Amino acid sequence: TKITFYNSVFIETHNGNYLFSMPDGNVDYLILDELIDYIERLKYTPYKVFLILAKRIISKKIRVELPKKVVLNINDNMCNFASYRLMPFSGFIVEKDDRIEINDKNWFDMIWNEEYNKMRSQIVAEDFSALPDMSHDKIIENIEYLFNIKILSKNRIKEFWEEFCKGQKAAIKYITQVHRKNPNTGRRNWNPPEGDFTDNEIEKLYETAYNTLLSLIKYDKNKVYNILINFNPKL
Amino acid sequence: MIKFIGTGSAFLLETGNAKILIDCGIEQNNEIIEKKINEIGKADICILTHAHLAASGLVPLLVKKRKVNKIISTPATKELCRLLFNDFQRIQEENNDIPLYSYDDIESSFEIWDEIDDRNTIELFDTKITFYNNSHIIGSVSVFIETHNGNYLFSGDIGSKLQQLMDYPPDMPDGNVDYLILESTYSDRDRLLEIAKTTCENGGKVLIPSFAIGRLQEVLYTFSNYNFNFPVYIDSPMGSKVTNLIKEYNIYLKKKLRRLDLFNNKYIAINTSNQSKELSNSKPAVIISASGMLEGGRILNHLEQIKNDENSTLIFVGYQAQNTRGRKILDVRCRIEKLNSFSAHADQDELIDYIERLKYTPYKVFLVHGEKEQREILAKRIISKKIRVELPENYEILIEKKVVLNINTDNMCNFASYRLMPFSGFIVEKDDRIEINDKNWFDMIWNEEYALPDMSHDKIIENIEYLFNIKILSKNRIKEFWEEFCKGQKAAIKYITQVHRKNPNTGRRNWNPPEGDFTDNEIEKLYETAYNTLLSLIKYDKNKVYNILINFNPKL
Amino acid sequence: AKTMKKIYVTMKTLSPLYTGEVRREDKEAAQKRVNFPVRKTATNKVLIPFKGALRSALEIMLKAKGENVCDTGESRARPCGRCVTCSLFGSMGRAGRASVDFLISNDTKEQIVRESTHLRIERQTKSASDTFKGEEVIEGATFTATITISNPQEKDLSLIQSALKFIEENGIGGWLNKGYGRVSFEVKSEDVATDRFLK
RNA sequence: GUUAAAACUCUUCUCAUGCUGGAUUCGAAAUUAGGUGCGCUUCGCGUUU
RNA sequence: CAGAAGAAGCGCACCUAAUUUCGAAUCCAGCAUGAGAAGC
């Protein structure tokens, strides 16, 4: 930082030859009638003068300025009205960890829909609030067979237990959703059985999974947990 | 930051999110041109000031090497460059030197070519490019690249007061130009028609060499106002093509000349080569033909009939470059004369007056082209105006436009894991600073402060409704009117003028004909109703045009 | 180990090409303007999935030879982990030795992607019943990818080359039976050291 | 009005180190830029032996 | 201060640019080390 003193501190960096208040070198920022000649004496007229006087020196073809996170506008049709170029804009300033965005109503509408979908899809009817019949051994036999072949998996048994904690009705909803044969694809959400088979047999094992899980929802929680804990040791 | 590549000349302005290019062109080695073209890199935009080969010649080479995504220019510069690039490829192939690009590169260059008028602010890649007329040729504009780290005015070739087709005072960014890129320069108007008077009264033919772009039209506009009794004739496919370009793009010329025909008939264009052979055998006429520097062209079949005839003259109405036959016989059994008054470039004074009419004095004026000798005396005179100047034989402040909140962000909540505040304010764009400002701002500024035809909004909707159900106005017509209106307002005037123009030979417009049992007179009143209705919609603002036109064409 | 195969794959597009946009925001932005958007990067380059095409190619050819390969095209089909396709491109036990990159264009979307009008004509009145717009990749556009095979084996470049020929015949991307996606592949293979970056 | 009363088990010292949500699965299947419009209008192979 | 090479006219319009399926499944969730030292 080359500094020189005049009858005036002429610091000469690479970001501009600043001078707080006439050297013969190029002067970039002048940190400033008698006043006008001082600027006229400087060769290579300064880019900005940091100061009634401003009106005149603007008309002397010179820029003025009269005395944190980066702010990014996202909102752009303006108008001349009341001299300065301008637009009406109502919006939202958001304060990010390294920036300040200036968003509009469409952003808030987007995040309103994104939050409302989260809100509305958290409670599903009688949470924590005509089933077929099966003997306990038959439930053990069918869950064991459909656990060896990969239909009732540990993720399926886990997600059965989580919904059955939330009541019988949510468990029937989950089992009906997994067994549902989509009319456009002809496919159920069961994981397909491993081992060579035939589509009638595969459909009957899917039906067996539907009836064995549905006959387990009528049982007591502790009895359901003690049936499934022999297969998925977590839950 | 700006890099001055220039063989080829170009101005790459790396903003930091794009590579915007100004005036890729070559006036005159193909391999060093290709290496210098490879030196630029992938550019997002290639802005053309004017349609001269000194600033547009390398544009198809850039789409050969796939280094440009969009070629924006003026709508008359584009049409000019169609003829310009096919003529350059005709000459290059014809010379038997290996073509630098191909006609397919011309076509594909016009495939990615967008076009905007003057005073139309585009916003591509966090920048604001706006064109302003500078009166060099038709469609010649200075370019305002308003970035965040500086606002740059590329002047281009500034025009002169000698020009008569384009409005003289060169339009300049109304705001603040940080860095300015000027091109340093390289009353005999009455004398032309006068010496044509004496020559053709003496019984000779004035054979004026004229450049096909700008020059020939200036010469013809001279003769087409000074009532030269003897007939005036242009002889050049390209010269007459640009004559029809000037008549078609009449709305892009001077405001007085925007009420047209512009050339006052007078010229009887010689179309075929055989007619030019006939006129060369024919014995008092004004041959405003076009080979440029007495090179190959429709001049040379007429050159011999003047070359031996001392009674005729050969009026050199242009600069005559070295290694050309024209400079050789400029510097001969005929009268030779020179009139530099017909010049399309400025002189040093007009460059200074173009630089003293900005709102705020530019920080650095980069001189780029011109003679290296004359660039020095221009530099000395503008340093005498206390203005920093960086010559191109040489190689610094960091201007940064910022956005000020000016609203108190205390009372602020988190709703959807975002720390937000609904705020009502009045954002302002000040020179160098965008300032969001509360109603307190409007208050203070409130107490401080306080052509196209005309139809009511309902009249416009009712007329477009009737013409849509009479099938004069269609969804395609509304689509292309919106397309030309998104290029500016003069492009839309030229569109509706072209569609509404009754052809003098066939009496046929380009309007879609009506549906019903209408008669001829009523059909013409509906055509004029369509013309005045769309011209009344040109006056309205773009956001007022859109909701009017969306109830007829939902996709434009 | 101790070497890694690198297959530098260069696509030139012979017929037009369509691979649709997968990103919901980019697709929903572009379905306002064009009914079939093309897959595009955020740096405005064209993105083609390449691992699944090479897998699917080798599964069809090795099932047609009679060599044992599993099917990973059937719905929720567990990979076997024993076949050569499971060694090259992966199973549920071991990851894929071949790390196929995305086919990324050497040029920008405003240079090789065009918007096109497609129709449905009524077979009897020979008149347009449907009109859609789709984005296609122009012919001659160049795409590049690196198939980076860790733990190299002898038949792992040739099968890839074999699969490339299948992708040359059948096509890559979408609309493969309407003629879209016929391409040419040029190959440059190198056995890079696994410790090449250690300076 | 208690072999009482009076006197803080106090100070110093991080549950730390080692371990990548990884593996498997192609936005593609269905849809012809099609439909409407005539290179036409004007000019005798003259004249001359 | 940049390119240039038997007549005539015309070389324009209009529509459509949508629809539909799928958006699941599966494995894993362990182990090891240290339990003391020092002042008042």
Ligand SMILES: [Zn+2]
């Ligand atoms: Zn020029």
Ligand SMILES: [Zn+2]
């Ligand atoms: Zn396998």
